[PDB]
Amino acid sequence: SGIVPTLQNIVATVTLGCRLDLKTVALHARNAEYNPKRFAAVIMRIREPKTTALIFASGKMVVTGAKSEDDSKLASRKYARIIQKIGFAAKFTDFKIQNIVGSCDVKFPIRLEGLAFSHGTFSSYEPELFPGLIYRMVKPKIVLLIFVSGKIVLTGAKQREEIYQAFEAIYPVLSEFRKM
Amino acid sequence: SFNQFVDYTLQDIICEDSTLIEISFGKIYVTKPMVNESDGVTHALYPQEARLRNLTYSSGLFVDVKKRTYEAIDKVFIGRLPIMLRSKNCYLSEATESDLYKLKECP
Amino acid sequence: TQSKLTVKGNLDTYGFCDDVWTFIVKNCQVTVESVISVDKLRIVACNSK
Amino acid sequence: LAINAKTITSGLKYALATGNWGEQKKAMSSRAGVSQVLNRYTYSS
Amino acid sequence: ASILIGCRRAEVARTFKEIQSLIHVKTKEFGKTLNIMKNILRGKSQNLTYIPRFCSHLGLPMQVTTSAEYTAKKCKEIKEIAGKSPITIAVVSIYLNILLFQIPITAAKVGQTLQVTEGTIKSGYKILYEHRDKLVDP
Amino acid sequence: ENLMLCLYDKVTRTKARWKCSLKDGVVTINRNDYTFQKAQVEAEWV
DNA sequence: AAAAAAAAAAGGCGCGTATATAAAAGCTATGGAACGTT
């Protein structure tokens, strides 16, 4: 065991607590994107940290695309200021971790069919559909996306250890349903 | 009688009140006897094997449909037919003696 | 005309508003058919539909 | 697409196996007595 | 979900795609539903079977099928990209056997018959030719 | 003045890379004038 | 003989498949209503 499921992404929503002018942000801001016919969301991205700001008409701004919690936070604080840089009285309010997407590798194929027959209470392999396996640990509430290549993808989390602590309790089962 | 049926009457039952408000029914096709082995192969089925394993000496039926969409007005499996032994469609219908023996089937 | 132009660089400012996409690709080359490297190529284009 | 072959298949089979000439829903109203079991007691029989 | 449950329990090999060709399920909500249903039934309380079905669908003899059987049996112990959705591995083992033989069922017919990739077969065949060492019974 | 006056029809991005298709425009580049029939632009936002 | 053109595809990523979160903004459908309608 002892494999850290590296967070492949971290999501975070921050509310500006205001109401911008969506056309105004499109014309004035530089790293901004917003299309009415598709979805009324401002597509704002900053090069450092490289995340995306899912800014809606109601000031709900989502920070996605970082790999760590604070990068998804640091980008947000930059995100709010650049909105303030437009000329609005935006405010960095209501920051929260939304989701932590993460994957790992075990370097050995796993008997997911073995995982499914004994741990079918917990396993789900769809070789015809999904080359991984969905192993949802209740405590912590983490889903282990368990691939035949060994890719154990973990997400549905806002706690960094929750991804980590769940794996430490699941590797022996993969060694149970391993080949070599 | 059976040959007559399976050669003419079968068809002319179809080429009857067939077309449906449009769907057409065409040539009807009859296979030699086979079995759809449960979760597995389909293959020929000699009478002997049928008798021993309680199968049914039957053949599948296939008929050709033309779906027809109305357009401004103004092939297909179906069922499975049991086969009379030594009917024109049975494996034995023409076999000779030595084969019959090899099929474990009394001449 | 028949010339084919190819531009590739770094985008620092993209802006969309009422089917008006504005791109500013920094240090991008313009490949005529003679490739012209443009450090600052103002791109203003609308919907063609 | 979605043609119930089992209809014809099972219908024919059941009818033969019991001899109630009629419909599988026809229990007694179906004419019966056809399709016996080929007495093989003695070749001439 | 319950149909695949019944087939697996009674040892019947059935493709999600076959089941979906029976029923419009959108296959993704189907995946989630089968997952939850399997978990429910596990609370309420082996991939070789697919070979002969396709052997029949392609019209292949029984010695060919048992050659494929032994090939698939060694497939589990021949990681080295062994399975990763082993339906591809089954179909490539079938392709190995037919190429070992002289059967005019060239990849086009098998692919269009089994709704499989014409390329994943050769992707497997790449490692299969190296793996050829551990596949000769007689 | 290095201004591309065209019409975009296709821009596809995969998390780090642009793929912009521009059609039937006029580009003036540094004392030069150029008009294309197709333009395929692939920028890179850091 | 030799130039130039006309046109199939190969291979690569299309995105797309599923898998899993996490976010409410056009649209859907569910859910609620009781009063117009004979």
Curated annotation (Swiss-Prot), chain A:
Record-level GO cellular component terms: nucleoplasm; nucleus; protein-containing complex; transcription factor TFIIA complex; transcription factor TFIID complex; transcription factor TFIIIB complex; transcription regulator complex
GO molecular function list: chromatin binding; disordered domain specific binding; DNA binding, bending; DNA-binding transcription factor binding; RNA polymerase I general transcription initiation factor binding; RNA polymerase II core promoter sequence-specific DNA binding; RNA polymerase II general transcription initiation factor activity; RNA polymerase II-specific DNA-binding transcription factor binding
Chief place of localization: nucleus
Single GO biological process annotation from the record: DNA-templated transcription initiation
Sequence repeats: 7-83, 97-174
Location(s), subcellular: Nucleus
Alphabetical UniProt keywords: DNA-binding, Nucleus, Repeat, Transcription
Quaternary structure, from the entry: Binds DNA as monomer. The 1.2 MDa TFIID complex is composed of TATA binding protein (TBP) and the 14 TBP-associated factors. One copy of each TAF1, TAF2, TAF3, TAF7, TAF8, TAF11, TAF13, two copies of each TAF4, TAF5, TAF6, TAF9, TAF10, TAF12, and three copies of TAF14. Interacts with TFC8.
Function as written in the Swiss-Prot or TrEMBL entry: General transcription factor that functions at the core of the DNA-binding general transcription factor complex TFIID. Binding of TFIID to a promoter (with or without TATA element) is the initial step in preinitiation complex (PIC) formation. TFIID plays a key role in the regulation of gene expression by RNA polymerase II through different activities such as transcription activator interaction, core promoter recognition and selectivity, TFIIA and TFIIB interaction, chromatin modification (histone acetylation by TAF1), facilitation of DNA opening and initiation of transcription.
Family of this protein: Belongs to the TBP family.
Protein name: TATA-box-binding protein
Shown segment, full-protein numbering: 61 to 240 of 240
From Swiss-Prot, chain E:
Superkingdom as given in the UniProt entry: Eukaryota
Sequence repeat residue numbers: 54-130
Localization: Nucleus
Subunit structure: Associates with TFIID-IIA (DA complex) to form TFIID-IIA-IIB (DAB-complex) which is then recognized by polymerase II.
Stated family: Belongs to the TFIIB family.
Described function: General factor that plays a major role in the activation of eukaryotic genes transcribed by RNA polymerase II.
Note: Present with 6750 molecules/cell in log phase SD medium.
Name listed for the protein in its UniProt record: Transcription initiation factor IIB
Protein species of origin: Saccharomyces cerevisiae (strain ATCC 204508 / S288c)
